[PDB]
């Protein structure tokens, strides 16, 4: 009467056993047990006669893979086979997505069971959910397994073709990563934009206005307003300049400068201003959807200041320990049990009035219904309360509680009433000598906070901006109303360069572009940092010089491999395989060898990966690949950054003791971000 259940982790193994009980033996497999060979020694004697064995994929036989058991896992497999001898049934209880199905498949291929096999799938670890999945198994989904394998093979083939190019042309020991190099490109593209940015200056006037003489009961009696128009011409703002600091070809504006603006203020000093136009418009904010993988990583980054990787390790533990639903999901759907628990929680915590009128469903179409069933929300039909979870996850597990609290608040808020308020608009007029001038003020009231009492999104550190519960108080003003000028400050400004990415904004970008998946966002963000391509300056991601060199090589000579659209399209086709709408072998064959299928002008339609990469590379100069153009000096001489084996250093060709060509060099580190190394900075380190 003995049943064996296999999962990926000891924590999950202990948790399922607690729920299953007697007559079940629950073991862990440490994740994957087989992979393609990673070394010549991974190749078994039987295959040492196959020249493709080390590669591990036989491209001339429909991409047959060589899966071997990694030496680090041979132990695990031995024990599993040992235990299998003594049971009546095998339960495979890995995660329900393509990774988990692939593990199940591999266990079947490795153990070769001669007893019944049931495959359990669940998206939360509770006693009911576990019991249910045991009683109602799901057939192994081969389409999922084929999708995972296609991606595994693709990565192997990609590394095989592309790494040698990086080795000859950039640096040895660099490792190719296809999606990674796209993520890297996004970051490098932003740094270049910052480097080509040129600021424009623009001035206006800020006034403090008092309404208390014309209306003794104005609330508040004072406020601020900005100069918006002078003599029918609209004052220049930051949005009016392009990245080169020149005015955009649109409507007609005045750029004020210091002397311009203070002349206007001095000519105003004395007068009153007059309310020409007050307007109220109500607004209604709908609450945030429940968390999915990308939005959870974003909010944890902006609010808790957790890296993407950190958020996923914590979420993993919460899920394995029964606290939350599955944390790899692109669904924001809540089950009816969860909608009711949130509604109740909200009514108990905040009031009957703060509960949405009718229950709120957030049903967005998921890419694959087999891998994602539900948003990320507290597990169990009744949510474990934040205090109870706070006590269990105290001390060392404090980051786990903090994430749970974030998830709980988000779920609860998602069932709450709309935020209500008014948005205030003001047109104030006046006279600075000859010219008529317009000051403007805007305001927002939050009459009824709604879900915002339970959850408010955090604004991106670098982008800046206003939170969705921020209010600007303005007094009730009426046309004709005179206003007293309390103070006038002529105000100078400059346009700013485009903000760098935080992890939160990178994840957002990967999602909008269709390049990231719930299973991949954090591993993408993590790897580009490990491998040195990118590092953090505070909360900002900054590319390293080697990132420029690699990105440059790929853009110049293999552009399709790092094109945002081609990348997204491939991610989509892999999902197509997962659904059963495209075949593993056809896809690999088209991708590697070329074919007539795929988005126009893609790798597949351009002759395949193999012909694409294997051009004549002797035409590609390593020296230029490792040279990043910065600018010319005040003598017309190109100054570039050279990526050398000893690292990054600045170089320029100068006139020597005889003449040119003489290279003048100066060494460089992390301390100087690319957009910080200006000509001033460069000259300063060429000399000292």
Q: How many CB atoms lie within 10 A of CB 105?
A: 22
State how beta strands 3-7 and 24-28 pair.
parallel
Name residue 204's beta-bridge partners: 491
Take residue 522 and report the two structure tokens written for it.
Answer: 């954090």
- Find how far residue 503's CA is from the centre of its chain: 6
DSSP string, 313-358: HHHHHHHHTTSBS-SS-------HHHHHHHHHHHHHHH-GGGB-SS
Crossing angle of the two packed helices 336-350 and 398-413, in degrees rounded to 10: 90
DSSP string, 289-324: PPB-HHHHHHHIIIII---HHHHHHHHHHHHHTTSB
Q: How far apart are the first and last CA of the chain?
A: 80
Contact 70, 42 (CB under 8 A): yes
Q: Backbone phi, then psi, for 431, in 5-degree steps?
A: -140, 115
Q: Does the annotation place 135 within a ligand binding site?
A: no
Number of residues assigned to the chain: 688
Burial tier of 416 (Cβ tally within 10 Å: 0-12, 13-18, 19+): buried
Take residue 569 and report the two structure tokens written for it.
Answer: 């399209």
Name residue 271's beta-bridge partners: 269
Helices then strands, each counted (H, E), the chain: 20, 22
Contact 94, 325 (CB under 8 A): no
State how beta strands 89-92 and 3-7 pair.
parallel
b/e sequence 286-299, b meaning 16+ C-beta within 10 Å: ebbbbbbbbbbbbb
The 3-state DSSP class for residue 580 equals: coil
Closest by CA to 183, choosing from 365, 35, 308, is 308
Tell me how far CA of residue 135 lies from CA of 128, 138, 613, 669, in angstroms: 11, 10, 51, 60
b/e sequence 498-537, b meaning 16+ C-beta within 10 Å: eebbbbbbbbbbbbebebbbbbbbbbbbbbbbebebbeee
Q: Backbone phi, then psi, for 163, in 5-degree steps?
A: -50, -50
Contact 103, 94 (CB under 8 A): yes
d(CA 686, CA 626): 19
Instruction: Check if 288 is active-site.
Output: no
Name residue 221's beta-bridge partners: none
d(CA 401, CA 392): 9
Closest by CA to 178, choosing from 154, 149, 153, 148, is 154
**Which of the residues 319, 323, 326, 354 is marked catalytic?**
326
Crossing angle of the two packed helices 545-557 and 178-196, in degrees rounded to 10: 110
Q: Does the annotation place 95 within a ligand binding site?
A: yes
Take residue 593 and report the two structure tokens written for it.
Answer: 């060898």
Longest dimension (CA), the chain: 99
Contact 278, 479 (CB under 8 A): yes
Take residue 380 and report the two structure tokens written for it.
Answer: 């169990």
Catalytic residue numbers read: 326
Residues making up the annotated binding site for Mg(2+) are: 8, 95
């Amino acid at each position: 009467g003995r049943r064996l259940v296999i999962v990926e982790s000891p924590t999950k193994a202990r948790k399922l056993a607690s729920y299953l009980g007697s007559g079940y033996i629950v073991e862990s497999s440490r994740g994957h047990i087989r992979d393609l060979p990673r070394a010549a020694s991974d190749v078994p004697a039987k295959y040492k006669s196959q020249p493709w064995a080390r590669l591990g994929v036989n491209v001339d036989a429909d991409f047959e893979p060589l899966y071997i058991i990694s030496p680090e896992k041979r132990s695990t497999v031995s024990e599993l086979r040992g235990l299998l001898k003594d049971v009546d049934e095998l339960y495979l209880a890995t995660d329900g997505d393509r990774e988990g199905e692939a593990i199940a498949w591999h266990l079947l291929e490795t153990l070769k069971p001669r007893i019944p096999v049931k495959r359990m799938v669940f998206h939360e670890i509770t006693e009911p959910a576990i019991r249910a999945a045991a009683e109602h198994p799901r057939d192994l989904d081969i389409d999922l397994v084929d999708a995972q394998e296609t991606r595994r093979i693709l990565d192997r083939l990609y590394g095989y073709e592309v790494s040698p190019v990086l080795w000859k042309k950039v640096a040895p020991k660099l490792s190719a990563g296809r999606v990674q190099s796209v993520a890297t490109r996004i970051i490098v593209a932003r740094e270049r934009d910052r480097m080509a940015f040129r600021s424009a200056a623009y001035w206006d006037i800020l006034a403090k206005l008092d309404a208390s003489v014309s209306d003794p009961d104005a609330a508040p009696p004072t406020f601020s307003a900005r100069l918006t128009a002078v003599a029918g011409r609209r004052v220049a703002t930051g949005r009016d300049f392009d990245s080169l600091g020149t005015l955009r070809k649109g409507d007609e504006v005045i750029v004020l400068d210091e002397g311009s603006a203070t002349a206007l203020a001095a000519g105003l000093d004395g007068t009153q201003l007059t309310v020409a136009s007050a307007e109220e418009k109500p607004y209604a904010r709908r609450p945030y959807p429940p968390f999915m993988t990308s939005t959870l990583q974003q909010e944890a980054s902006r609010k808790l200041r957790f890296s993407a990787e950190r958020t996923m390790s914590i979420a993993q533990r919460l899920y394995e320990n029964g606290y939350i639903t599955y944390m790899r999901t692109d669904s924001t759907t809540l089950s009816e049990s969860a909608i009711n628990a949130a509604r109740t929680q909200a009514r108990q915590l905040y009031g009957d009035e703060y509960v949405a009128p009718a229950p709120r469903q957030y049903t967005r179409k998921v890419k694959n219904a087999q891998e994602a069933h539900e948003a990320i929300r507290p597990a169990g039909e009744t949510f474990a309360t934040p205090d109870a979870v706070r006590r269990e996850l105290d001390g060392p597990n404090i980051d786990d509680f903090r994430l749970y609290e974030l998830i709980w608040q988000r779920t609860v808020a998602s069932q709450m009433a709309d935020a209500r308020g008014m948005t205030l608009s003001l047109r104030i007029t006046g006279m600075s000598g000859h010219q008529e001038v317009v000051f403007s003020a805007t305001g927002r009231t939050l009459t009824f906070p709604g879900f915002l009492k339970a959850y408010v999104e955090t604004v991106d550190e670098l982008v800046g901006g206003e939170a969705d519960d921020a209010e600007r108080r303005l007094p009730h003003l009426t046309p004709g109303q005179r206003l007293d000028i309390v103070e006038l400050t002529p105000d100078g400004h400059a346009t700013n360069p485009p903000a760098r990415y935080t992890e939160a904004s990178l994840v957002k970008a990967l999602e909008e572009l269709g390049i990231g998946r719930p299973s991949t966002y954090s591993s993408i963000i993590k790897t580009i940092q490990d491998r040195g391509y990118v590092h953090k300056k505070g909360s900002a991601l900054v590319p390293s010089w080697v990132a420029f060199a690699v990105t440059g090589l790929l853009e110049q000579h293999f552009g399709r491999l790092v094109d945002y659209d081609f990348t997204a399209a491939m991610e989509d086709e892999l999902d197509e395989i997962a659904a059963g709408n495209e075949r593993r072998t056809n896809w690999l064959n088209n991708f590697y060898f070329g074919g007539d299928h795929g988005v126009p002008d893609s790798v597949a339609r351009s002759g395949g990966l193999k012909k694409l990469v294997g051009i004549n590379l002797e035409g590609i100069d390593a020296r230029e690949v490792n040279s990043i153009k910065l600018f010319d000096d005040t003598h017309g001489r190109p100054i570039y950054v050279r990526v050398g084996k000893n690292g990054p250093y600045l170089e320029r060709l100068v006139a020597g003791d005889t003449g040119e060509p003489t290279p003048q060099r100066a060494n460089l580190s992390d301390s100087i971000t690319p957009d910080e190394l200006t000509l001033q900075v460069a000259e300063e380190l060429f000399a000292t």
